[PDB]
Homo-oligomer: A and B are copies of this chain.
């Protein structure tokens, strides 16, 4: 029914991204490619993973199928898979997932998809500011901010993009102008977010990876990571802090 072959890097990316918010997830094998979305139990953050069929070395499906996966077990297993190694995912029967790489075959019981928490709805967000930067830089900014507060402000206007954190005795400001950013629409936006979710999000990205920020005023933020040289897309949506 399902027989795909991907790189270790690709599989390790999808699993890590998801495991950040949920333990179990529905994985969709569409004509288009791999797709998986989840909302953490808090309903504060959402993750959207998209691996287009082109990215796969092999991508064979008979029909579009959905499977219930234990992400904690797949994640734990993917640590044994090398970055440059090739991994084969196979679904013959409707109860077990086969994961092949090297001389190792791993079999795991699938979860009844109806047993997993209802698949989330992709929110319709109208967001003025659009920021494109290096995910690595962003990661360093969040880490710096983390030493000051539990929360940061994402500020945007004609001057540029800012990440700011305030403590009782100190503060930190990350600032980049249109010149320094890869792409910037100079949109006006100001929202506040929890540093803890942001750190967790950044775990799936590094220097060289592209990050697209969709920002509004007291609205959720869209953090679109383009990883594995544009072969995988990991989007995180985070609800803001108000009042």
**A residues engaging B (CB < 8 A)?**
70, 73, 76-77, 79-80, 102-109, 137, 140-141, 143-144, 147, 169-176, 180
Q: When the two chains form the complex, which single residue of B70, B141, B180 contacts A104, counting CB atoms closer than 8 Å?
A: B141
Q: When the two chains form the complex, which single residue of B108, B170, B175 contacts A103, counting CB atoms closer than 8 Å?
A: B175
For this complex, 27 residue pairs linking A to B, each with C-beta atoms less than 8 Å apart, are A70-B169, A70-B170, A73-B169, A73-B170, A76-B147, A77-B144, A77-B147, A79-B147, A80-B147, A102-B137, A102-B140, A103-B174, A103-B180, A104-B140, A104-B141, A104-B172, A104-B173, A104-B174, A105-B175, A106-B171, A106-B172, A106-B173, A107-B172, A108-B169, A108-B171, A109-B169, A109-B170
Q: How far is the CA of A173 from the CA of B175 in the complex (A)?
A: 51
Q: How far is the CA of A143 from the CA of B173 in the complex (A)?
A: 40
Q: Which residue of B lies closest to A147 (CB)?
A: B76
Pairwise interchain contact B171-A103, C-beta atoms closer than 8 A = no
Nearest CB of chain B from residue A167's CB, rounded to whole Å: 8
Nearest CB of chain B from residue A212's CB, rounded to whole Å: 18
Nearest CB of chain B from residue A234's CB, rounded to whole Å: 23
Q: How far is the CA of A92 from the CA of B144 in the complex (A)?
A: 23
Q: How far is the CA of A137 from the CA of B79 in the complex (A)?
A: 15
Q: Which residue of B lies closest to A164 (CB)?
A: B105
Q: How far is the CA of A144 from the CA of B102 in the complex (A)?
A: 11
Extra pairs beyond A103-B180, A105-B173, A106-B172 (11, CB < 8 Å): A70-B169, A70-B170, A102-B137, A103-B141, A103-B174, A103-B175, A104-B144, A104-B174, A107-B173, A108-B171, A109-B170
Q: How far is the CA of A141 from the CA of B80 in the complex (A)?
A: 9
Nearest CB of chain B from residue A1's CB, rounded to whole Å: 19
